[PDB]
Design a protein around this ligand. Structure first.
Ligand SMILES: CCCCC/C=C/C/C=C/CCCCCCCC(=O)O[C@H](COC(=O)CCCCCCCCCCCCCCC)COP(=O)([O-])OCC[N+](C)(C)C
Ligand SMILES: CCCCC/C=C\C/C=C\CCCCCCCC(=O)O[C@H](COC(=O)CCCCCCCCCCCCCCC)COP(=O)([O-])OCC[N+](C)(C)C
Ligand SMILES: CCCCCCCCCCCCCCCCCCCC(=O)O[C@H](COC(=O)CCCCCCCCCCCCCC)COP(=O)(O)OCCN
Ligand SMILES: CCCCCCCCCCCCCCCCCCCC(=O)O[C@H](COC(=O)CCCCCCCCCCCCCC)COP(=O)(O)OCCN
Ligand SMILES: *[C@@H]1O[C@H](CO)[C@@H](O[C@@H]2O[C@H](CO)[C@@H](O[C@@H]3O[C@H](CO)[C@@H](O)[C@H](O)[C@@H]3O)[C@H](O)[C@H]2NC(C)=O)[C@H](O)[C@H]1NC(C)=O
Ligand SMILES: *[C@@H]1O[C@H](CO)[C@@H](O[C@@H]2O[C@H](CO)[C@@H](O)[C@H](O)[C@H]2NC(C)=O)[C@H](O)[C@H]1NC(C)=O
Lengths: 34, 120, 159, 85, 236, 60
């Protein structure tokens, strides 16, 4: 199966990707919409 | 007025999240300021410091969102390069938010010395 | 059973200070939904201060208000529409708060892997202790099916 | 008969898998992307505001491929995750 | 329970053992202190209770697992076609222990392809794989073949008490479950009951490819229903 | 418009990341030890739902 340090890396990667997509979305929406 | 109610409610929230009712229910001792290596017990005075910390942090963000213009209007009313005073004050607000977050993490690491992310 | 102050930081990182700030900003526009938000905030702040079990019901509002606050900030410091000074001032703040976001992600992962991910039936120099399941299974396999077991009330649900 | 079968069973031909299990993960991933691409287009087709006929003739032809890929992708992902089909 | 899979090309074995030691009972109850004392001094001294069992699996087994009815057991060790399993408690005289063992093998060394027709398969599956000196009062050997198979011939080396053919649905079995062929046996002995059940059957390519087709038909029906309910005016 | 299709794609992707995050953040005792029920009250919840599933909704 998958070990623990791998699931930790996976959780952290999911979180980072989520928070980066959220920041990009907010920037796009705030710059291109009054 | 909206401002009076806003301030009172925010101050009550800040007092409530700083473990104020812990000194009321439990009868703790003012000081010996922070009880080291204790995650569940606390001196009473720690409710008077954290408030300040919290009371400052939130405060700064409100200034960033709302009163950036008031500071230019009243500190340097020259109005020649207002867009520059705005930028400088925003940068300083960010720097001070960072300094106070660092202070918060420092006190939290005092209360729990096994903390990997101390911000400083 | 009152809760001390470090737990509020333990359970929410970087989002404890933003919560009062967001209540304030939500007390500056004062629409109809914002009254509900503020009442929720104040009531659950008190209740969680008193009882340590109600923090759960206080997290959804912490989150909401925090979000609101942060969003407001971004609405000013991520809206780029040259004057490079303003660009520097926007970059500084937006980067500081994205840094805080990443730090929050790391803190959250650490806290949940260290404090809220411990089994209950097995007890972990640093060997595994499986005495509860061993004894319960013995009881299950080598006792009569209609036997009555008398023990303290803490273990009745596992027994 | 048992002996006749036991002798039939010793035919030099042995089972050879269609797609080796070691390379089934990769396929899955690949399939996944396609399953996500084409399918998504079909969903966007709805709401085009064109004629009903065009939006149907397009939705069906895009789904008769999204499905065909998604079935294989599901089989491969199940096999790769340890739950064999 | 032996599950054959052509897509993954694997044969999964899973056994459930209701075991009991019928030796001399323990007089004066069970004393953990006496057990620890014996362990302390009596090194490799023959006993009449069960401490460790040694399951002998087929060559090249993988993904072993040893489970109980209250979660899994962590005292298990698999080396060189061998699997040592230690129960939760030492089975003394008159005690029971119901548990499960499982593992996986390559389907290449258990399924041969008939040279008569490329779509006709034969299988030789062992009857027993367990402890070196055990006794079985009841065996139910179930073989699960894919969703499309059609049994063609069957042979058992030792007499059976009942043989049945049915279907049992499993993961992603939509039309009709796996073909399940069950043999029943009464008095089997570990080393004496050698033999390989032989099962000839058919599996045409059209049944091979019917699984992704069924899954795709389900997904396609879901999509068509979503389209229908999304292109319908229910406004007032 | 163009933006109105971007903000949609992006949003979907975001909501797939959110899920992946939460789920992956909560499977830490299942992937280290085993998939089992943890505390006292969940064991009764499990007993009751198993009873429900086995017999009937009326009998439950
Ligand atoms: C929108 C959703 C899209 C998908 C997103 C989520 C999926 C990703 C999941 C990641 C890992 C999941 C697998 C866990 C690892 C093994 C679990 C296990 O081993 O447990 C299994 C349970 O298996 C499951 O049911 C898992 C299902 C497999 C998941 C594959 C993903 C595809 C899903 C797409 C669904 C499309 C539906 C179409 C409509 C027909 C218990 O096996 P057993 O005790 O019977 O032993 C088996 C041994 N015999 C057979 C000998 C007894
Ligand atoms: C709304 C959407 C939400 C999306 C997010 C939701 C859930 C994801 C979050 C967390 C997942 C936790 C991961 C647990 C994994 C434990 C099992 C394990 O460790 O598998 C790993 C293997 O992995 C893999 O290489 C799988 C690679 C395939 C990539 C995934 C395919 C896409 C599936 C999703 C879409 C499915 C349908 C598509 C069309 C409809 C170990 O396998 P093994 O050695 O144990 O057995 C296997 C025995 N062999 C090794 C012999 C086979
Ligand atoms: C506990 C409940 C926790 C809720 C926290 C209090 C929220 C009060 C929100 C009031 C905001 C405010 O600015 O009040 C103005 C009016 O106030 C008024 O007209 C009367 C003040 C509201 C009455 C309720 C005061 C709180 C009572 C609870 C505390 C007392 C102890 C309870 C044990 C509205 O602003 P505006 O600009 O729209 O005014 C337009 C005038 N036409
Ligand atoms: C309104 C009342 C809201 C509460 C509903 C109470 C029932 C909750 C769902 C049943 C829960 C449950 O355990 O169902 C099991 C299986 O599901 C089932 O047997 C069927 C699940 C639900 C039926 C399918 C959904 C009906 C469609 C809903 C439309 C609603 C109207 C829309 C305007 C039990 O099953 P069992 O053991 O008792 O089997 C007896 C065969 N008779
Ligand atoms: C674990 O496996 C053992 C071995 O089969 C199971 O023991 C069996 O348990 C059932 C019910 O617990 C016994 O049925 C009883 O039969 C007597 C007649 O002797 C009857 O008077 C009772 O009312 C009851 O129906 C069965 O005899 C017994 N088998 C043996 C050989 O002792 C045990 O139930 C299994 N435990 C679990 C948790 O699966
Ligand atoms: C051989 O087949 C099965 C073995 O389980 C038995 O026959 C069926 O038994 C089930 C009970 O598990 C009943 O529900 C069925 O009605 C029985 N008949 C059929 C046709 O399925 C029995 O042991 C044997 N049946 C024989 C000898 O006819």
């Amino acid at each position: 199966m998958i070990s623990d340090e791998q699931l930790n890396s996976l959780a952290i990667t999911f979180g980072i990707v989520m928070m980066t997509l959220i920041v990009i979305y907010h920037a796009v929406d705030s710059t291109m919409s009054p | 007025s909206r401002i009076i109610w806003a301030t009172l409610s925010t101050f009550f929230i800040i007092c409530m999240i700083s473990a104020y009712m812990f000194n009321q229910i439990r009868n703790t001792q003012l000081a010996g300021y922070f009880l080291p290596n204790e995650f569940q017990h606390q001196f009473a005075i720690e409710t008077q410091v954290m408030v300040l910390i919290y009371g400052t942090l939130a405060a700064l963000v409100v200034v960033l969102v709302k009163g950036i213009q008031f500071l230019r209007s009243h500190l340097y009313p020259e109005t020649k390069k207002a867009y520059f005073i705005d930028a400088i004050l925003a940068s300083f607000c960010a720097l001070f938010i960072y300094v106070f977050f660092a202070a918060l993490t420092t006190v939290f690491t005092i209360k729990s010395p096994a903390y990997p992310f101390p911000l400083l | 059973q009152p809760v001390s102050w470090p737990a509020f930081f333990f359970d929410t990182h970087f989002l404890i200070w933003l919560f009062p700030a967001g209540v304030f900003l939500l007390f500056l526009d004062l629409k109809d939904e914002h009254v509900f938000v503020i009442a929720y905030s104040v009531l659950c702040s008190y209740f969680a201060g008193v009882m340590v079990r109600l923090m759960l019901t206080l997290t959804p509002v912490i989150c909401v208000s925090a979000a609101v606050a942060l969003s407001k900030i971004f609405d000013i410091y991520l809206d780029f529409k040259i004057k490079p000074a303003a660009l520097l001032a926007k970059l500084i703040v937006s980067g500081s708060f994205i840094f805080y976001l990443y730090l929050f992600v790391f803190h959250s992962t650490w806290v949940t892997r260290t404090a809220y991910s411990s089994p209950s039936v097995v007890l972990p120099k640093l060997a595994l202790i499986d005495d509860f399941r061993e004894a319960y299974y013995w009881l299950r396999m080598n006792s009569d099916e209609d036997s009555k077991v008398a023990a303290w009330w803490d273990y009745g649900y596992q027994i | 008969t048992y002996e006749q079968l036991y002798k039939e069973f010793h035919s030099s031909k042995s089972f050879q898998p269609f797609i080796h299990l070691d390379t089934q993960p990769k396929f899955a991933i690949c399939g996944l992307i396609v399953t996500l691409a084409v399918l998504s287009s079909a969903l966007f087709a709805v709401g085009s505001k064109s004629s009903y006929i065009k939006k149907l003739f397009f939705y069906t032809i895009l789904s008769v491929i999204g499905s065909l890929f998604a079935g294989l992708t599901t089989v491969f992902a199940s096999n790769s995750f340890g739950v064999y089909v | 329970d032996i599950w054959l899979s052509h897509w993954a090309s694997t044969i999964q074995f899973e056994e459930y053992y209701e075991l009991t030691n019928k030796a001399a009972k323990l007089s004066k109850g069970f004393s953990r202190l006496e057990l620890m004392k014996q362990i302390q001094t009596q090194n490799m001294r023959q006993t009449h209770f069960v401490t460790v069992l040694d399951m002998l699996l087929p060559e090249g087994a993988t993904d072993h697992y040893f489970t109980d009815l209250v979660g899994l057991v962590s005292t298990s060790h698999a080396e060189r076609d061998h699997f040592f399993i230690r129960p939760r408690f030492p089975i003394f005289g008159g005690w029971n222990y119901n548990f499960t063992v499982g593992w996986t093998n390559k389907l290449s060394d258990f399924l041969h392809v008939s040279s008569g027709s490329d779509e006709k398969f034969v299988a030789s599956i062992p009857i027993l794989n367990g402890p070196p000196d055990t006794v079985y009062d009841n065996v139910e050997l179930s073989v699960f073949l894919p969703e499309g198979a059609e049994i063609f011939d069957i042979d058992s080396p030792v007499p059976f008490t009942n043989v049945s053919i049915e279907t049992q649905k499993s993961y992603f079995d939509l039309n009709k479950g796996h073909v399940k062929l069950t043999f029943s046996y009464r008095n089997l002995i570990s080393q004496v009951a050698n033999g390989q059940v032989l099962i000839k059957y058919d599996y045409p390519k059209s049944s091979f490819f019917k699984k992704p087709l069924s899954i795709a038909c389900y997904i396609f029906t879901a999509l068509m229903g979503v389209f229908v309910l999304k292109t319908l005016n229910m406004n007032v | 418009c163009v933006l109105s299709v971007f903000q949609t794609i992006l949003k979907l992707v975001i909501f797939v990341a959110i899920f992946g995050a939460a789920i992956s953040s909560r499977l830490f005792a299942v992937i280290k030890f085993e998939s089992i029920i943890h505390e006292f009250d969940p064991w009764f919840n499990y007993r009751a739902t198993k009873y429900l599933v086995n017999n009937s909704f009326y009998k439950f």
